[PDB]
Subunit: 296 residues, 4 copies
């Protein structure tokens, strides 16, 4: 069964221009807008998810990520984890229910890497736009812009990855799926963690600066959907970082692009199916180009 | 976190001709053979899996499924589940480690539907043919026969699916992803259960005769892999039940075919990503 | 170089309910409507084609095909073909330009199988909805309903297929790509002809009733588009003959579905690339 | 009907080492070796083609293309074209049958770009290994290495491209499918020519040096087959030039990779279906990069 931390729940990202951020994430990336609160934040979700939101933008003085949240099994689990975080020595903040639209109270804490993490058990279920009886495989939503299927994960850049790993694997019930070994005198330079049987729900890369956001990732259905994402990116003159290709790490096909404010995002699909009983895979530092781009 | 029952671990199926069975599963389905025991059973595993076996075939006078096993997180979980099964009212039998090659002891029990289910926490990890360091996405094994990636599930036909549902959801930690209503006599005629975030790890359909096996299912990479599987079946004179298509339930695109002995198996891919907190989808009997 | 007869130009089919015919062809199949004439006919084209029409519907009492036309290289070629058709022993009737919206004059004749074939060299070019400068690979149109790429061919049922083959290969510059042997009398019960390097531009099957239309066929981009077309059909309660699958007698995937009036159409993709110098492939009747 | 020049027939390429070439083309690219003559040349063909050869390699002190040939309808056609070429003002050479294994006589001539072109009508038909009766869609060969379907075309770099276009369109029966406009003072920097309904059977790009080969291209079945080709290249340490991506021109998906000797080749697929009555599409020079890489 899936217990404890279930999946990435939402990513709060700030854009320089809200208006063009709204247009981009709704008409280009194909996210479904789901509400706009009094703080000027607009909520989005993938057409296929069931919960109210998974991506929220806020016009800030700068770009980047405010926080990244994870939905847990239930309120009992939430309390349970908050307690384990404090027993571990981390200071937690309990954000009240309602602060975020259609969202319940959440437990927020800061990692050694500088990134703020959130844990919540409640968030209104709006459905995926498809009937609950005799549902079709998809609908027009699937063809609106790129239209990804779910917030798959995000990759953060910050210092002390080892400590971050410990909290995730010893406290949040995560486990190492893959790692990038730094130059001889081993220590993990990059770490891919899962709290399920997905290749990863979140990843971290050793970096001197803290609170850095490499990218938030969105799941696609097939390799042909990755191509189409690429075409859509070009049609909208979206700056692409790395064209359509495969990562060795996770074997996940992907494309890196930038949003109007410079926030990098990813549209990918594929990868194997690790379970908690599996041993992590490792990549040598010198061979990290292949782990990043596999064909190339 | 994935805890409790983790995933389908193995299916032991009966074949009327062991020789032809080994031939078909090794060449057509393209499963990797990993061993043969003294009883004459042959062990196979999908190439991308890491454990020693997931599909075992045993010659017999009748086709069908002997039992279906799920792997659990650890020994402590296995012991706990055994007690919950008994506390629930089910009789549990303990299979000694070693009885099945490279497999620890198992907790076996019989469902109201007639099928035998097993739980285990230990089974030797043999890997996926690829190195653990700087691993490649795939190798030649991926193109040997259909070459499915994992045993995905099975569909079992049994009489008391209502009580079966109770056991899987109330004892084993599974949950309802989808169901098929009964002629406005609204009872579930068919249920799809998941113990993870997969569309389903096992499924049952209401049926008068107990112990019936509808099919064991193997996962493929993509829709094009489904087509290739269809081509390979044809080159091998494989009897196909229903050509390549899409199931509304599960949304998975599959192909039903029969093995030489008459056992039906499935090669599919796709499906959404449900989670424990999701409500099940329903299908009207008439729209089945 | 491509010369003589170039490709299937248009197929005019009979629909029992004009309005519902327009709705199916423009919403489900996703063809682009290009005009309506004084006779009540509605014109469509595939989004990616460049000419004004490739598929015309006309309300009638019976479903079926009125005629199938091919576009030829130029006016000179058209004149030459007409003369050669006559010298061969066929009678030709010249239809004036404009008789069909945006269409030049046409050379029409009846095959021994009863079907009416037309040849023309003039058809207004309207574009594929994409700029001619810095053109994108596609646009919204490829996601409007099925959205096929081109009128690929048709399959006609008629008696006297052997004589039909002669006319096409000896007069129209076509060549045999594949054939289906007769039971053992050994003649051809079916033929797939090409006037390019496509697997087939038109095909025929020996059948008692003359002028029978089996289906018109539309080309798709990839195997996934075929799956998609399958889903759109189900969504629209479309009657499907045979679902997504591989042909074999042409090495291309496909779906046979029905028009609301009962006209079968095909959405497929794939196929190898034959050339005039290749020998035809053959199929035994039983294997067919 | 297809008449005149039917399609690309063969490319003879120079490799710096015949051994590394034979292991690479037969095992990595997945071509099928059909013969070897006493002159030290090894013949290859795609598994699905029917003729004896489409790709020939010869060991020399420099990489590059010796010549590119096209197959014509028949003998009469070959004579007609020879006469037309000479009547056009080009001198022609006749290579007797047999000079090349399993090949008939051919007409050779030089273009203003400095490339040697050949025309032939006779070449032994070996088949695709599959039966001619109740043939399967494919066999084990299509899973041998990349295993392309056909020699699709080649891209040649030279000068006097305008003169080259005139020869192919006014003499060899080809037509302009797409072109790349050169900065104001209209002329074409790039040209894609077809002698059938393929997006292109050959192309030329304006360049100083003469006789320069950009690459020979091989057709693949699908987008996923392109991804697989990239995976196989990585697996074989093959240096990749341009990762899996779409074009702009021709809509064709592709991957540019280098052989051991430095010769560039392409694994290609897709594209529309132009016909002789179609007007060519154009790409402005400034947009050339979208020309080569639509998505990025
Ligand atoms: C190296 C890598 C692998 C998989 C990802 O999703 C990603 O963002 C980075
Ligand atoms: C009815 C049904 C739906 C999905 C499946 O995977 C299956 O085996 C049966
Ligand atoms: C017999 C046959 C083979 C291929 C086709 O595309 C078709 O319509 C019919
Ligand atoms: Fe990522
Ligand atoms: Fe199944
Ligand atoms: Fe057809
Ligand atoms: Fe090329």
């Amino acid at each position: 069964a899936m217990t404890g931390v279930l999946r990435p729940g939402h990513a709060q990202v700030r854009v320089l221009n809200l208006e063009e951020g709204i247009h981009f994430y709704r008409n280009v990336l194909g996210l479904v807008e789901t509400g706009r609160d009094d703080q000027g934040r607009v909520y989005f979700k993938c057409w296929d998810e069931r919960d109210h939101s998974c991506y929220i933008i806020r016009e800030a003085d700068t770009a980047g990520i405010d926080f990244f949240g994870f939905k847990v099994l239930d309120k009992a689990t939430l309390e349970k984890l908050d307690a384990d975080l404090q027993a571990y020595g981390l200071t937690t903040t309990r954000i009240p229910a309602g602060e975020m639209l259609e969202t319940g109270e959440r437990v927020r804490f800061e990692l050694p890497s500088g990134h703020l993490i959130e844990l919540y058990a409640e968030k209104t279920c709006v459905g995926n736009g498809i009937s609950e009886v005799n549902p079709a495989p998809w609908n027009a939503q699937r063809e609106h812009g790129i239209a990804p299927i779910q917030l798959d994960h995000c990759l953060l850049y910050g210092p002390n990855i080892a400590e971050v790993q410990k909290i995730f694997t010893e406290v949040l019930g995560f486990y190492l799926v893959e790692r990038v070994l730094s130059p001889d005198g081993d220590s993990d330079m990059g770490i891919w963690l899962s709290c399920s049987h997905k290749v990863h729900d979140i990843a971290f890369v050793e970096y001197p600066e803290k609170g850095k956001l490499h990218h938030c990732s969105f799941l696609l259905e097939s390799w042909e959907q990755v191509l189409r994402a690429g075409d859509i990116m070009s049609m909208n003159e979206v700056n692409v970082d790395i064209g359509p290709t495969r990562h060795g790490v996770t074997r996940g096909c992907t494309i890196y692009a930038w949003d109007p404010s410079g926030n990098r995002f990813e549209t990918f699909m594929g990868g194997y199916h690790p379970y908690p009983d599996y041993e992590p895979l490792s990549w040598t530092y010198d061979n990290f180009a292949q782990g990043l781009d596999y064909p190339q």
